[PDB]
Every structure is written in structure tokens, then in C-alpha cells.
Design an enzyme around this catalytic site. Structure first.
Site, PDB file in Angstrom:
ATOM      1  N   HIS B  41      15.790  30.166 -14.775  1.00 15.61           N
ATOM      2  CA  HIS B  41      17.075  30.850 -14.677  1.00 15.61           C
ATOM      3  C   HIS B  41      16.992  32.337 -15.046  1.00 15.61           C
ATOM      4  CE1 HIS B  41      18.496  31.072 -18.914  1.00 15.61           C
ATOM      5  NE2 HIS B  41      17.968  29.862 -19.106  1.00 15.61           N
ATOM      6  N   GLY B 137      19.978  34.556 -26.077  1.00 15.57           N
ATOM      7  CA  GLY B 137      18.643  35.124 -26.230  1.00 15.57           C
ATOM      8  C   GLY B 137      17.600  34.103 -26.649  1.00 15.57           C
ATOM      9  N   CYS B 139      16.922  31.232 -25.163  1.00 16.66           N
ATOM     10  CA  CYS B 139      16.345  30.634 -23.950  1.00 16.66           C
ATOM     11  C   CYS B 139      14.836  30.886 -23.864  1.00 16.66           C
ATOM     12  CB  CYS B 139      17.063  31.154 -22.712  1.00 16.66           C
ATOM     13  SG  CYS B 139      18.851  30.846 -22.708  1.00 16.66           S
TER      14      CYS B 139
HETATM   15  C1  LIG Z   1      27.323  28.367 -23.054  1.00 19.52           C
HETATM   16  N1  LIG Z   1      27.983  28.801 -21.828  1.00 19.52           N
HETATM   17  N2  LIG Z   1      29.189  28.251 -21.503  1.00 19.52           N
HETATM   18  C2  LIG Z   1      29.553  28.884 -20.394  1.00 19.52           C
HETATM   19  C3  LIG Z   1      28.616  29.826 -19.984  1.00 19.52           C
HETATM   20  C4  LIG Z   1      27.599  29.753 -20.933  1.00 19.52           C
HETATM   21  C5  LIG Z   1      26.373  30.563 -21.100  1.00 19.52           C
HETATM   22  O1  LIG Z   1      26.354  31.413 -21.984  1.00 19.52           O
HETATM   23  N3  LIG Z   1      25.313  30.342 -20.296  1.00 19.52           N
HETATM   24  C6  LIG Z   1      25.381  29.661 -18.996  1.00 19.52           C
HETATM   25  C7  LIG Z   1      24.083  28.959 -18.649  1.00 19.52           C
HETATM   26  C8  LIG Z   1      24.049  28.105 -17.547  1.00 19.52           C
HETATM   27  C9  LIG Z   1      22.891  27.439 -17.191  1.00 19.52           C
HETATM   28  C10 LIG Z   1      21.755  27.631 -17.941  1.00 19.52           C
HETATM   29 CL1  LIG Z   1      20.320  26.710 -17.570  1.00 19.52          CL
HETATM   30  C11 LIG Z   1      21.741  28.490 -19.023  1.00 19.52           C
HETATM   31  C12 LIG Z   1      22.910  29.156 -19.395  1.00 19.52           C
HETATM   32  C13 LIG Z   1      22.894  30.131 -20.558  1.00 19.52           C
HETATM   33  C14 LIG Z   1      22.963  29.373 -21.886  1.00 19.52           C
HETATM   34  O2  LIG Z   1      23.558  28.306 -22.001  1.00 19.52           O
HETATM   35  N4  LIG Z   1      22.383  30.018 -22.926  1.00 19.52           N
HETATM   36  C15 LIG Z   1      22.388  29.665 -24.293  1.00 19.52           C
HETATM   37  C16 LIG Z   1      21.489  28.770 -24.880  1.00 19.52           C
HETATM   38  N5  LIG Z   1      21.533  28.354 -26.153  1.00 19.52           N
HETATM   39  C17 LIG Z   1      22.508  28.827 -26.918  1.00 19.52           C
HETATM   40  C18 LIG Z   1      23.488  29.751 -26.478  1.00 19.52           C
HETATM   41  C19 LIG Z   1      24.511  30.256 -27.320  1.00 19.52           C
HETATM   42  C20 LIG Z   1      25.402  31.178 -26.852  1.00 19.52           C
HETATM   43  C21 LIG Z   1      25.325  31.637 -25.542  1.00 19.52           C
HETATM   44  C22 LIG Z   1      24.364  31.164 -24.694  1.00 19.52           C
HETATM   45  C23 LIG Z   1      23.419  30.200 -25.128  1.00 19.52           C
HETATM   46  C24 LIG Z   1      24.071  31.098 -20.465  1.00 19.52           C
END
Ligand SMILES: Cn1nccc1C(=O)N1Cc2ccc(Cl)cc2[C@H](C(=O)Nc2cncc3ccccc23)C1
Ligand SMILES: Cn1nccc1C(=O)N1Cc2ccc(Cl)cc2[C@H](C(=O)Nc2cncc3ccccc23)C1
Ligand SMILES: [Cl-]
Lengths: 302, 299
Positions: B41, B137, B139
Site C-alpha cells: 500500500h 507511520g 506500517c
Molecule cells: C485507521 N483508518 N480508518 C480510516 C482510515 C484509516 C487510515 O488511517 N488508514 C487507511 C488504511 C487502509 C488500508 C490499509 Cl492496508 C492501511 C491503512 C492505513 C492504516 O490503517 N494505518 C495505520 C496502522 N496502524 C495504526 C494506525 C493508527 C492511526 C492511523 C493509521 C494507522 C491508513
């Protein structure tokens, strides 16, 4: 999101762990530049621990009596001196993996990471706090002596603890890296016991602010309290007195969440009275006290 | 004495963390030999073959410390992007890519901008999520176990679900659970307790002098599984019983004898008491973690 008990990455410390042997005793040492630091009780022969005269035991030793092993390499000891309860062994090779470091003495309530080692080999890393009674609730077996506690600030490692002993209740006592014990303990197997422990109030409040930051507000109430009335209540639950410094320290978390420190104190007062009633706070059924205000800011925001 | 949630020493993994940037996205990569592995991604319903075909090697900025690595190739394997670099990592440890089963635990080295910031221990939940601690960050942060001198990479972080829990893949890009790597409506299923792990933690409490919960009773495996089903506990199998054999022999408490203690704890609670400083029944320590922590195994 999420809240875990998190330790610092141990790599910079792993590259400093060595095995120190004197006679039949084997423990861990910390090799920084050309000096290996280890508990001075490595020179003791067990039936010495009741009343050891370390100066008398050390004067009878030569450099070649101390066997130092860094991985599969034997380091040569070229000098030795004692500083309080730590033995400093001068070696002929400076550690190439020596990180940027400092020796720091911490106060109770402070947290740190522990790299538990046996025979100069690191086996695990965990997070823990200096209890108000100056002990640590560690996970240590025989041979773990010389394992160290640390924090990492940017690229600098701050060494704050060296493991020396286990008290009768299963808790641990040790020194800072200058050999000064935390608490009224001594490196003697004399009858000594940990004092009555108390809860680190400022840390519980910090953890309640972290719960609010992560969307949990069930425990909040419409009340406030004076600092004095809070301490009067908290002391009855064996909680450490909350000082004006603690209140000041919690200011940033209070400003971020919009909940005044004395309002959060009223919530804590109510939690002590009612218990949690089947509910949890950040996946815990107990009030957590091993996260400082600084740890909460670092983990919940960065 | 003492019982802590303990992670593996992270040093061998820290030497592999790099920062990967593609356009406006920055996440972490794992540099092993001459390949950097990261979530696909980083190039972002997305058609990942169509998005990747439009990229060239110099579009991916890879940073290992204060050094920029040059990308000489790229390919996708499931949900992981593999970036071929010119320089092999000199700090590459002995390693394997392993896929774990729910209930199994691992250490997580949480990273931001290719820099490791913390290490924690956690378990693959039965619903295939992990209860981690991650921010924007994180990821590309990885989960691992250390076996002697070999690092077994088992997890790569990809996303956070609406309930605050985390989803990721093994190092071959196959997701744990019914999750997809895109912005869509997905949720973690109803979770359950890892029974074999709770029993292992009850044996560790006995080893540390905590015996109040023990009773004279035993149970059949069948009668216990009916109780487990009622309390959202995972079914306990004959393999779980066999795996707990060493702990049963060390403490002198038969596995089904400890199951009768757990049955009473489930129907009556702890009654103001704690076990190893916990008011909840802990399930993120496997039988092997208990043996390793109560024996002092090193790496
Ligand atoms: C959470 N969220 N709800 C709506 C939109 C998002 C969102 O920020 N992401 C969408 C998304 C969609 C698919 C994939 Cl594979 C990755 C992601 C990303 C993700 O999830 N990253 C994170 C990974 N771990 C803890 C995070 C904490 C806070 C922000 C982001 C984090 C970004
Ligand atoms: C525990 N104990 N109670 C009475 C006698 C002992 C005892 O084994 N030792 C006596 C003693 C006295 C003073 C000092 Cl400075 C060190 C020690 C040593 C020590 O405490 N080592 C350990 C250090 N850390 C965790 C241990 C866990 C299990 C065994 C040992 C551990 C040895
Ligand atoms: Cl301090």
C-alpha cells in the site's frame, strides 16, 4: 490507537553484555569503552555474603583472576577498582559496539527497560518501574546478576540500574551504575525486607489520561477535589501522596484532554471507592501505575 | 522470581529496519540481504498491478540510517512489495519467514520513519487481529520470534481496524484473517480467549508460589469444553493437553486438574484476589513462553 507496556529497543545494550567469572561465581557485566562494570559480589564465595569485607577480598585478587567473555572472545583484564557496590574491570580492548551513553540515577515512580541476561547472553526485554519502596518487580532467575535497566533518549542510552539481588518477597534490589543502591539495601545476605509498597499516583493519573486519549471516558465524573482532600483519601488506599510537582507535570495531558488535574483526581478517588464494576480501562481490571506522564506522551502522541 | 510480559531482544531486527518513501507515503521496510520488504500500500479499490506498473525504481526512496539505498528492481508477492536494492545488508541475521497460528505469541518492534521506537510482546488473537500499539507511520513494523540465533519473521503491520486493533500479513504478503489492504468497511470478528495460554499462565502462577485457585477437583476434557464454549474460551484439544505435559509434571498438577481450577475461576471469579498481579485471566503467554521465562533461555 492501542496502549501497551512498551520497552525500548534493546540492540544498543545487547552489544555491551559480557560474562564475568571470578572463581566459582559467574554473572553479567556491562562493557562500555575499555571498562566492564559488574556487581562487586562476583568476588564473594557465598559463605562471604553474610558479612563480606569487599576491600579485604578485592586486595587478594589479581587481574588474571577475573575471566571476562564477550561472545566467544576472552577479554584481558588490565586493572580493577571498586566504586561503591560496583566493580570496574579495566580491559585491553575498547567495545566497538559502545553506544552514546550516560549513567543516570532515577527517582521512584520512574520507569525503565530491563535486558535480562544469563552468562553474558540476553534472553529477554521487559518494562518496569522503580517502586516507591525502592525495589523493582522484575523477572529474574539465579545468574541474572549484572543485568541492566535503561532508557533510550534519541540515540543516547541512559543506564539507570544494575541488578544485584532478590529479596524474600520475590522483588529485586540493585544499584545505579555508580554502585549506589536504590533503597536501604546492602549487598549482604543479611535479614532485610522490602518496606510496605505504595501505588504511584502520578503514574495512575497519567494512565487515566492515556485512556481518555484513546476514547475511554466512563470513569470521569462531574466532581473536582482539593489537592489536600485527594491525598487524605488516597493515603487510605496506600497511594503515594500527590505533590504540586506531580500536578505541574500532568499539565500537558490536562491541556490535551481538557480535563483539569484535580478533576481527574476526583475520578481516581471514585474509582478507589467503587472499583471498576466489571469494566476495564485500557484492557486492565486494575489501576496501572508503571507508565509515567512522559511515557504516555511518548506512546500516545510521539 | 517474577513474571513479566517479555519480548525477545530486538537487536537482530533493529539492524534491518529501513524507511521507504513513495510519493507522499512513508512507512517502514525490512532489509534482508539485497531485498527490502514493505506493505504494497506504500504505492497508494486499488488495482496494485496497474499502480505498480506505472512506477520506476527511482520513485522508491529507501533510507537505511543516514544512507540512501538505490533501488534496482521491484516485484509484488501478495500484499508485500519487494524492492531489490544494490547493497546487501551487512547486519542481516540468520532468518526464516514463518506463518504463525492464532494463540501463538511474538515480539513487535514498533518503528516510525525506519527508526525503532519500542518493543512489545503480543499474541495473534483467535480472530486474527493483534491488540498492538501503533500510530500513523507504524506500517511495515514487524513481529518476530528468536530461535537460538535464527530470527523467525512472522508478521508485518498493514492497518488498524475501527475498534483500535491491528491487521497485518506474514512476510510472504498473506494476510492473517479475512482482511484486505484497502479503505473499506471491515471489522474484527468476535474474539475468544486462548485457553491453552491461560492454563500455561496458571502453571506459571503456581511456579511463583500463587496456589489459592487450586482445588481437589478434576474434569473430563468434554465437560471442560462445554464450560469453555459458554465463556467465549477457545476449545482445548488433546494437543494442548500434551503440550502442557512438562508444566503438569513440574508442578504436580494434572492438566485436567488445572482445567477444574479454571472452570471454578470462570463460574465464580477471583473474589478480590489477583494471580501474578492481574485481576483478569492472562492469555498472551504460550506454554513455551512460560517454560522459557521460568528457565532462563538466552539469544
Ligand atoms: C485507521 N483508518 N480508518 C480510516 C482510515 C484509516 C487510515 O488511517 N488508514 C487507511 C488504511 C487502509 C488500508 C490499509 Cl492496508 C492501511 C491503512 C492505513 C492504516 O490503517 N494505518 C495505520 C496502522 N496502524 C495504526 C494506525 C493508527 C492511526 C492511523 C493509521 C494507522 C491508513
Ligand atoms: C534469593 N536469595 N535469598 C536468600 C539467598 C538468596 C540468593 O540466592 N542469593 C543471596 C544474595 C545476597 C545478596 C546479594 Cl547482593 C546477592 C545474592 C544472590 C541473589 O540474590 N541472586 C539473585 C538475583 N536475582 C534474582 C534471583 C532469583 C533467584 C535466586 C537468586 C537471585 C544470591
Ligand atoms: Cl527520575
Amino acid at each position: 490507537s492501542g496502549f501497551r507496556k512498551m520497552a525500548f529497543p534493546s540492540g544498543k545494550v545487547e552489544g555491551c553484555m559480557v560474562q564475568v567469572t571470578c572463581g566459582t561465581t559467574t554473572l553479567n557485566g556491562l562493557w562500555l569503552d575499555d571498562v566492564v562494570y559488574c556487581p562487586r559480589h562476583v568476588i564473594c564465595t557465598s559463605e562471604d555474603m553474610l558479612n563480606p569485607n569487599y576491600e579485604d577480598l578485592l586486595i587478594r585478587k589479581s587481574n588474571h583472576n577475573f575471566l571476562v567473555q564477550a561472545g566467544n572472545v576472552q577479554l584481558r583484564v588490565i586493572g580493577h577498582s571498586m566504586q561503591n557496590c560496583v566493580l570496574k574491570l579495566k580491559v585491553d580492548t575498547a567495545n566497538p559496539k559502545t553506544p552514546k551513553y550516560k549513567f543516570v540515577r532515577i527517582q521512584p515512580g520512574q520507569t525503565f527497560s530491563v535486558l535480562a541476561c544469563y552468562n553474558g547472553s540476553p534472553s529477554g526485554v521487559y518494562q518496569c518501574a522503580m517502586r516507591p519502596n525502592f525495589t523493582i518487580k522484575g523477572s529474574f532467575l539465579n545468574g541474572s546478576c549484572g543485568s541492566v535497566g535503561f532508557n533510550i533518549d534519541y540515540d543516547c542510552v541512559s543506564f539507570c540500574y544494575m541488578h544485584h539481588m532478590e529479596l524474600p518477597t520475590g522483588v529485586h534490589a540493585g544499584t545505579d551504575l555508580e554502585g549506589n543502591f536504590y533503597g536501604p539495601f546492602v549487598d549482604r545476605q543479611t535479614a532485610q525486607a522490602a518496606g510496605t509498597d505504595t501505588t504511584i499516583t502520578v503514574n495512575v493519573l497519567a494512565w487515566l489520561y492515556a485512556a481518555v486519549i484513546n476514547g475511554d471516558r466512563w470513569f470521569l465524573n462531574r466532581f473536582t477535589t482539593t489537592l489536600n482532600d485527594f491525598n487524605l483519601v488516597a493515603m487510605k488506599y496506600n497511594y503515594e501522596p500527590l505533590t504540586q510537582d506531580h500536578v505541574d507535570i500532568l499539565g500537558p495531558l490536562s491541556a490535551q484532554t481538557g480535563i483539569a488535574v484535580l478533576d481527574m483526581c476526583a475520578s481516581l478517588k471514585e474509582l478507589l471507592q467503587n472499583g471498576m464494576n466489571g469494566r476495564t480501562i485500557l484492557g486492565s481490571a486494575l489501576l496501572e501505575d508503571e507508565f509515567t506522564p512522559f511515557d504516555v506522551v511518548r506512546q500516545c502522541s510521539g
